[PDB]
Design an enzyme around this catalytic site. Structure first.
Site, PDB file in Angstrom:
ATOM      1  N   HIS A  41      34.184  -9.595  72.958  1.00  0.00           N
ATOM      2  CA  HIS A  41      32.957  -9.361  73.721  1.00  0.00           C
ATOM      3  C   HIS A  41      31.683  -9.306  72.849  1.00  0.00           C
ATOM      4  O   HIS A  41      30.593  -9.134  73.389  1.00  0.00           O
ATOM      5  CB  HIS A  41      33.038  -8.158  74.675  1.00  0.00           C
ATOM      6  CG  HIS A  41      33.040  -6.815  74.019  1.00  0.00           C
ATOM      7  ND1 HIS A  41      34.205  -6.068  73.914  1.00  0.00           N
ATOM      8  CD2 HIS A  41      32.008  -6.082  73.537  1.00  0.00           C
ATOM      9  CE1 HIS A  41      33.851  -4.938  73.322  1.00  0.00           C
ATOM     10  NE2 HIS A  41      32.539  -4.899  73.081  1.00  0.00           N
ATOM     11  N   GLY A 143      28.022   0.521  70.353  1.00  0.00           N
ATOM     12  CA  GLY A 143      28.029   0.029  68.979  1.00  0.00           C
ATOM     13  C   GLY A 143      29.321   0.337  68.232  1.00  0.00           C
ATOM     14  O   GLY A 143      29.584  -0.263  67.186  1.00  0.00           O
ATOM     15  N   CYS A 145      32.358  -0.421  69.122  1.00  0.00           N
ATOM     16  CA  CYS A 145      33.391  -1.426  69.354  1.00  0.00           C
ATOM     17  C   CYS A 145      33.810  -2.084  68.043  1.00  0.00           C
ATOM     18  O   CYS A 145      32.981  -2.241  67.155  1.00  0.00           O
ATOM     19  CB  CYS A 145      32.947  -2.447  70.400  1.00  0.00           C
ATOM     20  SG  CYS A 145      32.287  -1.718  71.927  1.00  0.00           S
TER      21      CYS A 145
HETATM   22  O1  LIG Z   1      32.230  -0.530  76.841  1.00  0.00           O
HETATM   23  C1  LIG Z   1      31.455  -1.006  76.015  1.00  0.00           C
HETATM   24  C2  LIG Z   1      30.873  -2.396  76.174  1.00  0.00           C
HETATM   25  C3  LIG Z   1      31.645  -3.149  77.227  1.00  0.00           C
HETATM   26  C4  LIG Z   1      31.269  -3.149  78.565  1.00  0.00           C
HETATM   27  C5  LIG Z   1      32.104  -3.756  79.490  1.00  0.00           C
HETATM   28  C6  LIG Z   1      33.272  -4.373  79.066  1.00  0.00           C
HETATM   29  C7  LIG Z   1      33.525  -4.342  77.704  1.00  0.00           C
HETATM   30 CL1  LIG Z   1      34.889  -5.217  77.073  1.00  0.00          CL
HETATM   31  N1  LIG Z   1      32.768  -3.745  76.794  1.00  0.00           N
HETATM   32  N2  LIG Z   1      31.028  -0.336  74.929  1.00  0.00           N
HETATM   33  C8  LIG Z   1      31.262   1.014  74.616  1.00  0.00           C
HETATM   34  C9  LIG Z   1      32.424   1.489  74.014  1.00  0.00           C
HETATM   35  N3  LIG Z   1      32.685   2.776  73.760  1.00  0.00           N
HETATM   36  C10 LIG Z   1      31.760   3.667  74.091  1.00  0.00           C
HETATM   37  C11 LIG Z   1      30.531   3.343  74.710  1.00  0.00           C
HETATM   38  C12 LIG Z   1      29.559   4.311  75.063  1.00  0.00           C
HETATM   39  C13 LIG Z   1      28.395   3.936  75.666  1.00  0.00           C
HETATM   40  C14 LIG Z   1      28.149   2.605  75.964  1.00  0.00           C
HETATM   41  C15 LIG Z   1      29.058   1.639  75.640  1.00  0.00           C
HETATM   42  C16 LIG Z   1      30.274   1.973  74.992  1.00  0.00           C
END
Ligand SMILES: O=C(Cc1cccc(Cl)n1)Nc1cncc2ccccc12
Ligand SMILES: O=C(Cc1cccc(Cl)n1)Nc1cncc2ccccc12
Lengths: 304, 304
Positions: A41, A143, A145
């Site tokens: 992603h 951030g 990820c």
């Molecule tokens: O979830 C995602 C981005 C995303 C969105 C939809 C699908 C996928 Cl594969 N990835 N990033 C995050 C990971 N962990 C914590 C987070 C905390 C706040 C904001 C984003 C966070």
């Protein structure tokens, strides 16, 4: 004595963390040999996240669109490919700090350390478990990820998790290092059902053995139980069923303390039915389930 | 989102750990520049531990009696000296992995990471706090002496603790990196009184702010209190008195959540008086006090 939620030393993994930028998106990558592993992603904008066609999105990307930075030096990307939900960026330089490593897919109930990173720089290390519903209860911000989970056996790092998502519920989902998600989760911004988060019974039992080893014995009673009787209570309290494999895995702890597994089960059964009554076990007011029997033995024997 | 007991990445400190052997005793040392710091009780046998005269015991020891090993290579000791309860072994080689460092003496209530070591090899990393009674609730076995506590500010490691003892109660005592014990403890095998372990009120408040930031808001009520009214309840529950300095230190968290410090105090007051009623806050059934307001802000903003 003393019992703590302990993580592995993170130095070997710190030496592998890099920053990967594609377009406007920046996340972490894991640099092992001449390959940088990162969540696919990284190629998506927030708009694309609703229904991404990763194959189509990837076609518009060339090697020069993946900016890989290790410390303050830029790595030259000479190849790119998608493996399930991870991108593998072939770089021209092998990581001089690559430790001995393995890629393993862990079971629900197993524990691992997470080195939380932002922009390829580590911010912290904590210990967690793969929940029975395949989520993790991490601590991750936007951030993070590409931050990884790992175990260490003397000098060999077994990478087991790469962080990808935060579900609307605040729990976390991710993949093993081959890009396969743990659980039914997909890397899409859509309504995803985590599932019932049950308690890892064998881990609670291991932690009860750790408490006895460390002097907390108030919960030890004069009763015993059977696997079937224990499990009737365990199901009622959303506890994972205890099997003979679990009884066997608790063997060393049972031997060290002289307390039969079924006797510790009867103690756990009474703690479930009657509560803690305002008391604590190893400084906790709830039953801890993020220590495996291996973690308990390791911590109580000082394995380096 | 998600909130975890997070430790600093330990790599910078792993590069400083060595094994120090004197006679039959082996413990850990910290190698920074051309000096190895270790607990002075490395010169004692178990017999000597009852009433050691370290000055007299040290006289019988020469440079060649201190065996310092870094990885698998032996370091040549060209000088030795006692500074309070630490020995400083001058070696002929500066540690090539010495990070930017400071030696600081922390206050009771401050948190730090511990890299638990055995035979100069790290086994784990966990986060803890210096208790108001100057003990730490670590996880340490025989051989862990010389394991250190530290904080990291970007690239500078501030060493604050060196492990020396386990008190008969199972809590831990140690020194700063100048050899001065935290608290009234002495490096002697004698009856030592730890003192009342009070709760670090300002840290509980910071963790209540972390819970609101992370979505756990059930404990927020319609009440407020005053510092003096709050403190009457706090003393009753062996909580540290809350001062205006603490209210000021919670300012950023108060601003981020829009909840006035005295309103969070009234919530804490009701949680103390009525209990949790079987509910949890950030997955905990008790009030957590090992996160400072700085730790909460750092974790919630992703400082690397
Ligand atoms: O979830 C995602 C981005 C995303 C969105 C939809 C699908 C996928 Cl594969 N990835 N990033 C995050 C990971 N962990 C914590 C987070 C905390 C706040 C904001 C984003 C966070
Ligand atoms: O306390 C000592 C040795 C000692 C004895 C008396 C005075 C002094 Cl300065 N040092 N070592 C230990 C430290 N931490 C944890 C331990 C767990 C088990 C056995 C020893 C442990």
């Amino acid at each position: 004595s003393g019992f703590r939620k302990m993580a592995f030393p993170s130095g070997k993994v710190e030496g592998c963390m890099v920053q990967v930028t594609c377009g406007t998106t920046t996340l972490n990558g894991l640099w092992l040999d001449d390959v940088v592993y990162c969540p696919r992603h990284v190629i998506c904008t927030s708009e694309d996240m609703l229904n991404p066609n990763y194959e189509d999105l990837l076609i518009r990307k060339s090697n020069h669109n993946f900016l890989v930075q290790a410390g303050n030096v830029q790595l030259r990307v000479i190849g790119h490919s998608m493996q399930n939900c991870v991108l593998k960026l072939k770089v021209d330089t092998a990581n001089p700090k690559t430790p001995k490593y393995k890629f393993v897919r862990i079971q629900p109930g197993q524990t691992f350390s997470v080195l939380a990173c932002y922009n390829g720089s580590p911010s912290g290390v904590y210990q967690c478990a793969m929940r029975p519903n395949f989520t993790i209860k991490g601590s991750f911000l936007n951030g993070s990820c590409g931050s990884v989970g790992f175990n260490i056996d003397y000098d060999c790092v077994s990478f087991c998790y790469m962080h990808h998502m935060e579900l609307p519920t605040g729990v976390h989902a991710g993949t093993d290092l081959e890009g396969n998600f743990y659980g039914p989760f997909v890397d899409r911004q859509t309504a995803q059902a985590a599932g019932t988060d049950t308690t890892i019974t064998v881990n609670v039992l291991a932690w009860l053995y750790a408490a006895v080893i460390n002097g907390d014995r108030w919960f030890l009673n004069r009763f015993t139980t059977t696997l079937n009787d224990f499990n009737l209570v365990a199901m009622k309290y959303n506890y994972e069923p205890l099997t003979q494999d679990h009884v066997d895995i608790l063997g060393p702890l049972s031997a060290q303390t002289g307390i039969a597994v079924l006797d510790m089960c009867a103690s756990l059964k009474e703690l479930l039915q009657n509560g803690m009554n305002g008391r604590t076990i190893l400084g906790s007011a709830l039953l801890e389930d993020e220590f495996t029997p291996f973690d308990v033995v390791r911590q109580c024997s000082g394995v380096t």
